[PDB]
Amino acid sequence: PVIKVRENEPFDVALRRFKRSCEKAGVLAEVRRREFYEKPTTERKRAKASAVKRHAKKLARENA
Amino acid sequence: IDYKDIATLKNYITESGKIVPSRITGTRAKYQRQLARAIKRARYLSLLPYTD
Amino acid sequence: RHYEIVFMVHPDQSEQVPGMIERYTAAITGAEGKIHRLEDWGRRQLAYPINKLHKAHYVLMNVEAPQEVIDELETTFRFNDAVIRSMVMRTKHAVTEASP
Amino acid sequence: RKQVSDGVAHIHASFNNTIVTITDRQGNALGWATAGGSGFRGSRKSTPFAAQVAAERCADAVKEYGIKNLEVMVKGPGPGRESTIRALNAAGFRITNITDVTPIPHXGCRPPKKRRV
Amino acid sequence: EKSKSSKEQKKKQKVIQVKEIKFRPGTDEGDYQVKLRSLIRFLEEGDKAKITLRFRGREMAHQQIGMEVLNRVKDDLQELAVVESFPTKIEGRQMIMVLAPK
Amino acid sequence: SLSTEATAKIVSEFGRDANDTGSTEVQVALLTAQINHLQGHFAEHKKDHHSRRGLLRMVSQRRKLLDYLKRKDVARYTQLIERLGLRR
RNA sequence: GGGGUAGAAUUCCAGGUGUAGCGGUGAAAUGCGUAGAGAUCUGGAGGAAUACCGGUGGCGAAGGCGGCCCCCUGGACGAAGACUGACGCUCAGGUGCGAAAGCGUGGGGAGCAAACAGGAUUAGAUACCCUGGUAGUCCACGCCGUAAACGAUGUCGACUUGGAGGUUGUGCCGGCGUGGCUUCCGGAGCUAACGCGUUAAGUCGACCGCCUGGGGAGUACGGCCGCAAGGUUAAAACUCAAAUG
Ligand SMILES: NC(=O)OC[C@@H](O)C[C@H](NC(=O)[C@H]1NCCC[C@H]1O)C(=O)N[C@@H](Cc1c[nH]cn1)C(=O)N[C@H](C(=O)O)[C@H](O)c1c[nH]c(Cl)n1
Ligand SMILES: [K+]
Ligand SMILES: [K+]
Ligand SMILES: [K+]
Ligand SMILES: [K+]
Ligand SMILES: [K+]
Ligand SMILES: [K+]
Ligand SMILES: [Mg+2]
Ligand SMILES: [Mg+2]
Ligand SMILES: [Mg+2]
Ligand SMILES: [Mg+2]
Ligand SMILES: [Mg+2]
Ligand SMILES: [Mg+2]
Ligand SMILES: [Mg+2]
Ligand SMILES: [Mg+2]
Ligand SMILES: [Mg+2]
Ligand SMILES: [Mg+2]
Ligand SMILES: [Mg+2]
Ligand SMILES: [Mg+2]
């Protein structure tokens, strides 16, 4: 997230662009997941439950 | 897909230099795999960047 | 069996590149060398620094050769202190058409 | 002393603490100030306000160098990411750019075990 | 980094805390030995040991059986501790014996 | 695997024709060729257990084909194993 | 399977700049720092792992397998044919493979971390929390042979309404088919029920493994295997009138 303040821009507008650049790039989410060690079984289990949730919401979006 | 075709590859990397998901770009799975190989080969040769 | 060799030379040693490109092709064409493509890309800007260098002299070669002579060529690139990086690839077919 | 036209504000924003350090463009330290050294102690350090104060004291340390331009280099997930730079701009430096320089391993080393709390 | 390197040696002055072990009248031998080994560990390391004995319900009738347990710990830790204060009456529903390191 | 030329040699040698790829002689000759070829591979690569499973399948398929040829025609069997240099 | 190599990051070392904190928690303290830390910048060293891509995506008999490149190598699948001519299915014993921990010998050791040391917490705290930290985690070779090694579902073959997806071939003219693998739902049927449902737990056939109340016990004894840790095979007395889904 590299944000050069462009020719004549306010700070508050420029700060919104910087925070959004970080939000999209995925830096705070990335640091937090790398804070503590997650063993592969936990990783895989987490990934399965997300996949179940995502898919089950589509079947709740359907049938309605 | 070609590792030398920097123009096309640059459409499927972010500003930081990270490969974009196929759900976003709408790429087919087979080509997404070729794309990822190409980008990593381009990264090795310093045609594309890893980071920053 | 259809290779694709990129190698990047130290940008100060762009004058050596003439002599080296001869040696490599001469060795390949020694043993049924089929130089399908040869493109001096020139001194390009690197996307990141390699050995405190922000430029290097790129070269491309698509060749068909023995699988021994390419391994013997790979041995030379290691010894060549000028040449900084190289990727030898395997292609399924010959590539004659031009790259950007 | 020397005058410096343009500086760099390195903001080491950890979860527990904020370190603000103004350097030259070549990363030579001019002055530094922390939330822990700003009369905040313990978990008082880990607020946006304590970072804001640390920024101000850092600005006050590098008044003598006569800096008007700073490039920001924020690092970490700390609560005082945005509060530092806001307070740096309030000191009256023109913030030319903002960069995120948070180290991400491309895999890297195995992290410590999860806290069971 | 100056005054701390003096105050470290001032901090080394050991701070004797009181360690509370609570007995009952019913406490069995095996469990008494655990609690005794706990008390030994404290008094070995130069820590004071508050020794409560809690009564429940109609155990307040038979107080002397509680006193036997408190008497026994004193006897077992006779040469490893001195009795700073021995209880007399049941304050609340407890009798507290504070021991001290020798 | 064997090369297309290596295959085409064996089919001509051990077959009744170049079209005859099916015959037990060809099959056993092909299996033998590859089994013998892979002995060098597994000499160097001792820990390649995943590939070795493929080798054991070749040996098991050869055995079964030879046993079939024995009870079908001993003359063809006896000729084949002496040509290829198989013990049994 | 083998070899090479790239970038990021942690740690450490050497310097420069700089100055009083750093680190940590629920709150602290231990710890680190004026012999100059933390921070920041330049360079170097070393080990381990490969962000994004990444997907109820793929591959593999199972265990498992994730940077990129080459070398060696196993399997699967599709299209048309051509060929062999029942050569098949299953498999007690046997043989091999088999996560992690562990064991032997020799290397290696960044990060992490059983044990352990100190700091806390507490009624106690042989813990959870904090600061350190050894084996180990890594490599070679040999050993061990077990896991909720799970789909808690043996292998092979045939048959029996549907719907919506994913992945990977292929023919024909985005459309219309047709193969392989795979996810979710659901019909008959089945099931104690939950559920399963063409990838069956349906309807059948072949062969193997296994069960016969709970605890005692996967224990004892004996055999076999192991350097050891232990593994494997595997009871009974006795006691209960339950245990269980
Ligand atoms: N010591 C004793 O014999 O009894 C006292 C015990 O019951 C205290 C109680 N402890 C807990 O729950 C544990 N949860 C696991 C992490 C450690 C610890 O925290 C507790 O209430 N803690 C507080 C912090 C504390 C410790 N001593 C006095 N206060 C606490 O914040 N607990 C949190 C919770 O209950 O959700 C949580 O466990 C937590 C966050 N951070 C920490 Cl440390 N613990
Ligand atoms: K070189
Ligand atoms: K048999
Ligand atoms: K260690
Ligand atoms: K029911
Ligand atoms: K035994
Ligand atoms: K019984
Ligand atoms: Mg597989
Ligand atoms: Mg598994
Ligand atoms: Mg079978
Ligand atoms: Mg292991
Ligand atoms: Mg060892
Ligand atoms: Mg540690
Ligand atoms: Mg710990
Ligand atoms: Mg078992
Ligand atoms: Mg089972
Ligand atoms: Mg169903
Ligand atoms: Mg049933
Ligand atoms: Mg046993």
Numbering used by the authors:
A (entry chain U): 2 to 65
B (entry chain R): 21 to 72
C (entry chain F): 2 to 101
D (entry chain K): 13 to 118, 130 to 140
E (entry chain J): 76 to 177
F (entry chain O): 2 to 89
The authors write:
During bacterial translation initiation, the 30S ribosomal subunit, initiation factors, and initiator tRNA define the reading frame of the mRNA. The first step during bacterial translation initiation is the formation of a 30S pre-initiation complex (30S-PIC), which comprises the 30S ribosomal subunit, mRNA, initiator tRNA and all three initiation factors. Upon correct decoding of the start codon by the initiator tRNA, the 30S head shifts from an open to a closed conformation, and the 30S-PIC transitions to a 30S initiation complex (30S-IC). The structures reveal that all three antibiotics bind within the E-site of the 30S and preclude 30S initiation complex formation.
In silico sorting revealed that like the Ksg- and Ede-30S samples, the GE-30S sample also contains one major population (601,047 particles, 63%) comprising 30S subunits with mRNA, IF1 and IF3, and a second minor population (69,483 particles, 7%) with the additional presence of initiator tRNA and IF2. The main subpopulation without initiator tRNA could be further subsorted and then refined to yield a cryo-EM structure with an average resolution of 2.4 Å. As seen for the Ksg- and Ede-30S-IF1-IF3 structures without initiator tRNA, the 30S-body is well-defined for the GE-30S structure, whereas the head appears highly flexible. Focused refinement further improved the resolution (to 2.3 Å) and quality of the cryo-EM map density for the 30S-body, IF1 and IF3. Although we observe density for the SD-antiSD helix in the GE-30S maps, the density for the mRNA is not observed extending into the A-, P- and E-sites. However, there is an extra density located in the E-site that could be unambiguously assigned to GE. In the GE-30S complexes, the binding site for GE is located at the tips of h23 and h24, which differs from that observed in the X-ray structure of GE bound to the T. thermophilus 30S27. We observe that GE binds in the E-site where it makes extensive direct and water-mediated interactions with nucleotides of the 16S rRNA. Specifically, the 3-hydroxypipecolic acid (HPA) moiety of GE contacts nucleotides in h44, including a hydrogen bond with the backbone of U1506. The 2-amino-5-[(aminocarbonyl)oxy]-4-hydroxypentanoic acid (AAHPA) of GE interacts with U788 and U789 in h24, whereas the 5-amino-histidine (5AH) stacks upon G693 of h23 and can also hydrogen bond with U788 of h24.
